[PDB]
């Protein structure tokens, strides 16, 4: 039917039906709280408890299960051969790098030791969310004696506007896992990088640990250190990026935020509501995938506990600390990118595509909003909308109005912005953090799920040190299995905009959708043409690859 807000219905012709639907919604979709301090989730002990309309269809259920089975059968074969052999060379990781890898993963296996490939991933790799433009040297970067030349190169880049940083201080104080009684280890690194005129982003220095007042300074690793020393330092930043990417950029910001959006929407916006109709398709499978994740991925004795250095509880502590710090602006590429100083960096394909995708969605949302809300007053008086943002910000996000989340929507502009934030969260925000796994994480030394020795406090690493720190064959194989499972071409995916159900009636909304689809296709083509000229195509925000919801 035609959508109708409560403002559209002063005689209450649809009041009883919408009120009855919301009362049933609020019984079926209740808030749960998997861990103290985390943003809230759907209340459901496991997948069998979920409302029926949230369950995987058969095709998705078969796909998700069978793909685990295949990943686990491959892990069994890998492990059965590797126990019979030595594991004493970086070439040992070849033995687990089976056929069927993506073209980009084959490039990573070839080039992972290149400093330019290490730096490239901060712009356009699996985790584009951490890098920030530097306007001063961080207070933690303290120089041991003899490093005057480093200090001058850092000053030249800073004066030229070309100094960037990746600071992993969220890992400070996080407890590391113990796996089959062997201690795992975490670092708390900082990497300073230079942006070159040709677009390359090069690491200048790495510090692995925070200085401690009563202690000698951490060493500063440099690209001129002995090859294994600098390699080990880089591996440690890569292992640290795996932890903050998967937990903060991917789980919290993609998956868990999309679930908060979904639950608050189910609880407050009835099916006759235009903004329900606009949002719905973008929630597909989010609650079941997350329930599955809480019961097998990040659960006690789950994947993280089995193979990941933050596993065993530290991962939950990091989630609660990151949850307390989320800001609204960080979910909106125009604000996030300005704030991090990535706007205008021609080498950031993530920035260029994120901003364009945000605009195309913004136009679609504005289209639908203007069909149903003629004035700012018609937004202000929509009490379902007002209940909606409050439930989202106050209950779902544990009181986040001081971090920029809305508790009222008082204009069409505001409504459009917030809806746009919601749709981008469920789509591009996830795709850009999820799709890299297949290309960058299947070559395990490029993103070690764990580390088995403490980070070095000297410059004497050998290959033996590197092999003994890097994941063992089992940990590395399970990493490959799950990253393939999640990362691989999704046979049941719905691409952005391509949902088949018609929530809206009428030519009005149909025309806005047709235009969204046309603009998305034109953007996809423009990225495809840019990518044909690049050494490494940036694929993760192309509309043809961006999924319509968080489903995996």
Q: Which residues bind Fe ion (CB under 5 A)?
A: 434
Of 61, 292, 363, 403, the residue at the interface with ligand OYP (CB under 6 A) is 292
What angle in degrees, to the nearest 10, is found between the helix axes of 383-390 and 257-268? 150
The reply, when asked if residue 250 is annotated as ligand binding, is yes
Of 469, 483, 548, 549, the residue at the interface with ligand OYP (CB under 6 A) is 483
Which of Fe ion, K ion, ligand OYP, none has residue 378 at its interface (CB below 5 to 8 Å by kind)? K ion
Helices (H), 180-326: 227-244, 257-268, 274-279, 286-296, 303-307, 314-325
Of 266, 293, 365, 513, the residue at the interface with ligand OYP (CB under 6 A) is 293
The reply on whether position 411 binds K ion by CB under 5 A is no
The reply on whether position 310 binds ligand OYP by CB under 6 A is no
Q: What binding mask, one character per residue, do residues 350-389 give for ligand OYP by CB under 6 A, x or -?
A: ----------------------------------------
The reply, when asked if residue 248 is annotated as ligand binding, is no
Of 3, 5, 319, 421, the residue at the interface with K ion (CB under 5 A) is 5
Write out the binding residues for ligand OYP, residues 211-250 only, by CB under 6 A. Answer: 246, 250
Strand, helix or coil at 191? strand
Select 40 or 293, whichever has its Cβ closest to ligand OYP: 293
Q: Which residues contact 377 (CB under 8 A, 6 or more apart)?
A: none
Q: What binding mask, one character per residue, do residues 503-522 give for ligand OYP by CB under 6 A, x or -?
A: --------------------
The reply on whether position 308 binds ligand OYP by CB under 6 A is yes
| Count of Cβ atoms closer than 10 Å to residue 376 Cβ | 15
Of 420, 427, 485, 548, the residue at the interface with ligand OYP (CB under 6 A) is 485
Write out the binding residues for ligand OYP, residues 66-85 only, by CB under 6 A. Answer: 68
Write out the binding residues for ligand OYP, residues 246-275 only, by CB under 6 A. Answer: 246, 250-251, 255
Residues of the chain by 3-state class (helix, strand, coil), percent to 5 = 55, 5, 40
The whole-angstrom separation of Cα 383 and Cα 403 is 23
To 5 degrees, how large is the angle CA 140–CA 146–CA 150? Answer: 60
Strand, helix or coil at 298? coil
The reply, when asked if residue 289 is annotated as ligand binding, is no
The whole-angstrom separation of Cα 245 and Cα 257 is 15
Strand, helix or coil at 204? strand
Stretch that binds K ion, among 10-18, 27-35, 371-379, 458-466 (CB under 5 A): 371-379
Q: What is the number of H-type helices and E-type strands within the chain?
A: 21, 9
CA dihedral (143, 147, 151, 157) in degrees, to 10, reads: -120
Select 238 or 434, whichever has its Cβ closest to Fe ion: 434
Number of residues that bind ligand OYP (CB under 6 A): 20
Instruction: Give, in order, the Cα–Cα distances in Å from 446 to each of 29, 176, 353, 408, 443.
Output: 40, 20, 24, 44, 6
Stretch that binds ligand OYP, among 147-155, 274-282, 397-405, 479-487 (CB under 6 A): 479-487
The reply, when asked if residue 17 is annotated as ligand binding, is no
CA dihedral (519, 520, 525, 526) in degrees, to 10, reads: 70
C-alpha closest to that of 276 among 25, 106, 532, 533: 25
CA dihedral (248, 250, 251, 257) in degrees, to 10, reads: 90
Select 256 or 470, whichever has its Cβ closest to Fe ion: 256
Is there a contact between 384 and 525 (Cβ–Cβ < 8 Å)? no
Select 448 or 455, whichever has its Cβ closest to ligand OYP: 448
The reply on whether position 289 binds ligand OYP by CB under 6 A is yes
Shortest Cβ distance from residue 251 to ligand OYP (Å)? 4
The reply on whether position 378 binds K ion by CB under 5 A is yes
Of 478, 493, 546, 551, the residue at the interface with ligand OYP (CB under 6 A) is 478
Residues in the annotated binding site: 250, 255, 430, 434, 552
Binding residues for Fe cation: 250, 255, 430, 434, 552
What is the binding site for ligand OYP (CB under 6 A)?
68, 246, 250-251, 255, 289, 292-293, 296-297, 303, 307-308, 449, 478-479, 482-483, 485-486
């Amino acid at each position: 039917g035609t959508a109708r807000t409560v403002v559209d219905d002063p005689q209450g012709l649809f009041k009883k039906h919408r009120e009855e639907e919301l009362a049933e919604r609020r019984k079926l979709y209740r808030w749960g709280n998997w861990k103290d301090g985390l943003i809230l989730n759907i209340a459901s002990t496991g997948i069998h408890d979920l409302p029926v309309d949230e369950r995987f269809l058969e095709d998705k259920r078969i796909d998700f299960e069978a793909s685990l089975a295949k990943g686990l059968a491959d892990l069994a074969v890998k492990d059965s051969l590797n126990v019979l052999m030595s594991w004493n060379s970086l070439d040992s990781f070849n033995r687990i790098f089976w056929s069927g890898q993506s073209k980009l993963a084959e490039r990573v296996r070839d080039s992972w030791k290149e400093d330019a490939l290490f730096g490239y991933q901060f712009l356009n790799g699996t985790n584009p969310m951490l890098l920030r433009h530097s306007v001063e040297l961080p207070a933690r970067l303290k120089f041991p004696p003899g490093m005057e030349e480093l200090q001058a190169q850092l000053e030249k880049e800073l004066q030229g506007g070309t100094l960037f940083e990746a600071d992993f201080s969220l890992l400070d104080g996080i407890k590391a896992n113990v796996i089959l009684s062997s201690q795992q280890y975490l670092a708390v690194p900082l990497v300073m990088l230079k942006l070159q005129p040709d677009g390359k982003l090069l690491p200048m220095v790495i510090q692995l640990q925070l200085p401690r007042e009563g202690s000698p300074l951490p060493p500063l690793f440099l690209p001129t250190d002995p090859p294994m020393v600098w390699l080990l330092a880089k591996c440690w930043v890569r292992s640290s990026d795996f932890q903050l990417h998967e937990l903060h950029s991917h789980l919290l910001r993609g998956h868990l935020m999309a679930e908060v959006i979904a639950v608050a929407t189910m609880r407050c916006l009835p099916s006759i509501h235009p903004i329900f109709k606009l949002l719905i398709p973008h929630f597909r499978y989010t609650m079941e995938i997350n329930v599955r994740a809480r019961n097998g991925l990040v659960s006690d004795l789950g994947i993280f506990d089995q193979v990941v250095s933050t596993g065993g509880g530290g991962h939950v502590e990091l989630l609660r600390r990151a949850a307390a710090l989320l800001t609204y602006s960080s979910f909106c590429p125009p604000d996030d990118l300005a704030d991090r100083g990535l706007l205008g960096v021609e080498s950031s394909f993530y920035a260029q595509d994120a901003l364009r995708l945000w605009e195309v969605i913004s136009r679609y949302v504005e289209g639908i909003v203007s069909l149903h809300y003629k004035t700012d007053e018609s937004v202000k008086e929509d009490f379902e909308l007002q209940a909606w943002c409050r439930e989202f910000t106050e209950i779902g996000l544990l009181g986040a109005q001081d971090r920029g989340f809305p508790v009222s929507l008082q204009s069409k502009e505001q409504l459009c912005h917030f809806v746009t934030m919601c749709i981008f969260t469920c789509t591009g925000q996830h795709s850009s953090n999820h799709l890299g796994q297949l290309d960058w994480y299947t070559w395990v030394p490029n993103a070690p799920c764990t580390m088995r020795l403490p980070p070095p406090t000297t410059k004497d690493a050998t290959l033996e040190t590197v092999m003994a720190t890097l994941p063992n064959f089992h940990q590395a194989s399970l990493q490959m299995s799950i990253t393939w499972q999640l990362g691989r071409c999704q046979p049941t995916m719905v691409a952005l905009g391509q949902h088949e159900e018609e929530y809206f009636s009428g030519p009005g909304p149909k025309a806005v959708l047709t235009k969204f689809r046309e603009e998305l296709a034109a953007l996809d083509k423009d990225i495809e043409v840019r990518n044909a000229k690049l050494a490494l195509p940036y694929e993760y925000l192309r509309p043809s690859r961006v999924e319509n919801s968080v489903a995996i």
